[PDB]
């Protein structure tokens, strides 16, 4: 007899990592809203990570990010236009520096979303990591207002949690935005207010840093008569609440018994 219910050739079946899944969904959501995804480098200079974003040194505000400083010659970090740049190297503490790199290399109006791995010197536990992911958002152009930032997050919530979903905005501080704000979303199933990220209207000094670097590079100013909003949200926190994952350390853990569990969600 030709047993048809017998195991067939053991061809391998692949899968995508949960962060890749979460990031993808997040990118899909924003693509539908007109956002384009671009990435930045993990090793940045203090200039892009801090100074260009209105976060000076010995600044009590620079303590909001526990930085990993680097050392070593021979490494050539290129700027927005491929040009080699200088400054104390570090691991970006957020994706925000990409806001600056992009703006000097392009012209408004535009919509970008920049995903990426970030690093912060912290003790890795159940809900904390030294290595995680963020997703930046940047929309610049004439007449761009905070009403648009609120509109963006509102669409994010709807797409993420359904029609019974809602967002709340509260003032908060960031050197690169003003007005500044933190936003939370209403997750119906969990019946809880989830804090997703921060945002605001691009700070006046950011545009100045951008155009200053531009002239210093030969390009003409492109940000004097425009405004914009930016936002940044943590990927793991969201991936966890969405795939029901208890420990954030698994993401980098490597357990196949763990990763394999997302072959379904592709």
């Amino acid at each position: 007899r030709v047993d048809v219910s017998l195991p067939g050739a053991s061809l391998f079946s692949g899968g995508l990592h949960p962060i890749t899944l979460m990031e993808r969904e997040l990118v899909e959501i924003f693509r539908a809203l007109g956002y384009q995804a671009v990435e930045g480098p993990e090793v940045e200079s203090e200039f892009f990570n801090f100074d260009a974003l209105n976060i000076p040194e010995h600044h009590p505000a620079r303590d909001m990010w526990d930085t990993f400083w680097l050392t070593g010659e021979g490494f050539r970090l290129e700027g927005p236009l491929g040009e080699e740049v200088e400054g104390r190297l570090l691991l970006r503490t957020h994706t925000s520096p990409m806001q600056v790199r992009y703006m000097v290399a392009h012209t408004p109006p535009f919509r970008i979303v920049v995903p990426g791995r970030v690093f912060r010197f912290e003790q890795t536990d159940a809900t904390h990591e030294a290595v995680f992911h963020q997703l930046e958002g940047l929309v610049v152009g004439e007449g761009i207002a905070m009403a648009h930032l609120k509109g963006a997050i509102y669409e994010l919530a709807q797409a993420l949690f359904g029609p019974d979903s809602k967002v709340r905005f509260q003032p908060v501080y960031f050197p690169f935005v003003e007005p500044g704000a933190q936003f939370a979303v209403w997750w119906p199933e969990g019946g809880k207010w989830l804090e997703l990220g921060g945002a605001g209207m691009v700070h006046p000094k950011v545009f100045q840093a951008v155009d200053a670097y531009r002239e210093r590079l030969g390009l003409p100013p492109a940000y004097r008569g425009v405004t914009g909003f930016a936002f940044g949200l943590g990927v793991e926190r969201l991936a966890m609440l969405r795939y029901g994952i208890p420990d954030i350390r698994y993401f980098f853990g490597g357990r196949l018994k763990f990763l394999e569990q997302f072959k379904g969600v592709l």
Partner: protein, 785 residues
Amino acid sequence: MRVPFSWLKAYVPELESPEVLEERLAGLGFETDRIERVFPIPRGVVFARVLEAHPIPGTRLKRLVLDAGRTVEVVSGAENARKGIGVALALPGTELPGLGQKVGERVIQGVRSFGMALSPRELGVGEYGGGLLEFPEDALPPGTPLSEAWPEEVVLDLEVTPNRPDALGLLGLARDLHALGYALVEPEAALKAEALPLPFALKVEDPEGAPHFTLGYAFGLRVAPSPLWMQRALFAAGMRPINNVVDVTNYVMLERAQPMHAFDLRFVGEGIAVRRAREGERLKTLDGVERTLHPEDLVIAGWRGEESFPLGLAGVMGGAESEVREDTEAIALEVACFDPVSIRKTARRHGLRTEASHRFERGVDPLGQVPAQRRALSLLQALAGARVAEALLEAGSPKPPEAIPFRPEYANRLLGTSYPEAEQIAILKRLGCRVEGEGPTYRVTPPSHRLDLRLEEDLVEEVARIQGYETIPLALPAFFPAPDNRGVEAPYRKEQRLREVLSGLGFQEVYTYSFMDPEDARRFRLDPPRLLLLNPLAPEKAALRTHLFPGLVRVLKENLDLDRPERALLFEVGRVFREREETHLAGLLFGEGVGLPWAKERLSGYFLLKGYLEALFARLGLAFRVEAQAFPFLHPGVSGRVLVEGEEVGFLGALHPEIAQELELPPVHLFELRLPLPDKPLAFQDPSRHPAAFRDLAVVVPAPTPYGEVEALVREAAGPYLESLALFDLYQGPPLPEGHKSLAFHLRFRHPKRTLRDEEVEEAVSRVAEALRARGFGLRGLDTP
């Protein structure tokens, strides 16, 4: 329709050139498919006067004595050749667009033919070559190069959409250009009418068919060739001139989208009656075709006493008899508006497509008949010396068009423009609309010739096209989508990913026609197709495919004949029909298999395909398995149905050998499922850290028993701590109870928290060993060093 530049230029004198005209018309909504320069006429062709025509004895040719400046003789075999007409004389030495070999002096049947008289085909102005061009005898001074009165012309092939039937008349086109700002010159139908009764009556027996019908009366007719200018005009529009009366009816038709027909009174009798045709009634149309009429055919008839007879097929084509010729002295001019649907059906029914039917099918100005009569009669008076009665016979009274509400503010809002009100209103007037009121909402009543203008929207398009679509700004809309539009793209996305996973996994996508050969229902052994085509492209594609795999097997075949693929892993997603339309996914496997090309071993056939599918589902995160079940089109030995998440959705197996035979093909493996596939939620299973238990043991079972039962039996009994469970070996042979087999099973147990003690396992494994026997199986795998 063909649009002769200089003819159109007669209504729109300011036209820049054929090229600027094509641009103007494009922006008005009329695309030209071709611009053509048409009447190149050499110096050698001159106008000649036929002084006399002498038949050459013993032949069917004539010796023409022509006045072409000096007298010359020419031989012609054309039946229309005769004294008293003007002709196109190609003098010896002339190079004509056709023959390529110069025209010269030549001896024909005893006479020196000094050149030759031309037909439309020989001169290059028309396709007709059955007779000579016929001109007015005094059209020009004898010997005058013909080109001097017949310049080359440029003709545009215009596409005229169904909504602009008024554009089926050159004057219609002229109106649109006028709206753009060009001065419009309308012909003035100057009549010198006479007050007297028409020597005939009108009886419209079918008012639905002929909602408006008029008859004009012209007498004292002097039937002769049309002026050169009219023949040039008609030829450029694709029509062949016949004589002044007939030509005038064709020229006006082309001028104002109004077919009309001169009926020779000799055959009319006491009157004309527009009536349905009596079944069996015969009628020889002017195309020479002898036809028989249907009772649904509207007819133009005449009557004499108790006799009633067909004169023409209404709105389609006139009869051969009453058709106007040289001895015609008086006529009844038919200018009407027929029922589109009626003409539509008749035209189809008799396989006729004429300039007349075309226009009546598309629609004619419901109130244009009287003005059209004036034009035609006026022309008849000028070109045929006609006397015309001031009265017309008329039946029907169409009501003028109603007013349309119009708001300049809405026009700009709908378009996203900001045209000042005054320009909007003026545009509408240029097009001939009446505009009343003060605003914001006006009362605009369109001209009867514009059948397409009924809604306010139609009116905004008038403003848009005249201002120019290019003057409409570009913008992007911004809005929060209504709630129920949320995630509506899920289904489409789901299937797309399935294609991509498949595409990457190794399957090659194929696209096959939704049609199927009714015969294959028999061949591939399937239930007959439920939907059929009442008008298939061919009997081979007369039904709607019921399955997807048949098409795949077919492409495998034709692929093996054009190229010789040593193998192939295909797949196709498509709509299948049966009781209900549904989406299907089908795959096909064939060939040597997979492995080292230079080596020998191979992974092929059923299990190879089953492997891939297992992968696909592992990747989709859905439970998969194939149980035994036979299918007419499969192999009773290699056949089973597919279960996704414990739900039947299709089949899997080897094609039937017999089936492979009629189609001459090697063993083919395949499957077919129904989409969309089931969806399994993520119930994330946190993996325990504590080590797991490792245990083996085989199972003895009869050659029949499906791997299924065993696996399920073993599994369900393994307990709530069974982690893994895989098959690593099959034996069936010596020294086993002949007719039995052994199944090598790797097992693993684990626990969420605490670790597992040898007691819990050695004890839970028992709960499976004895339930394995309660069914009738043992545990060959025992005591392993």
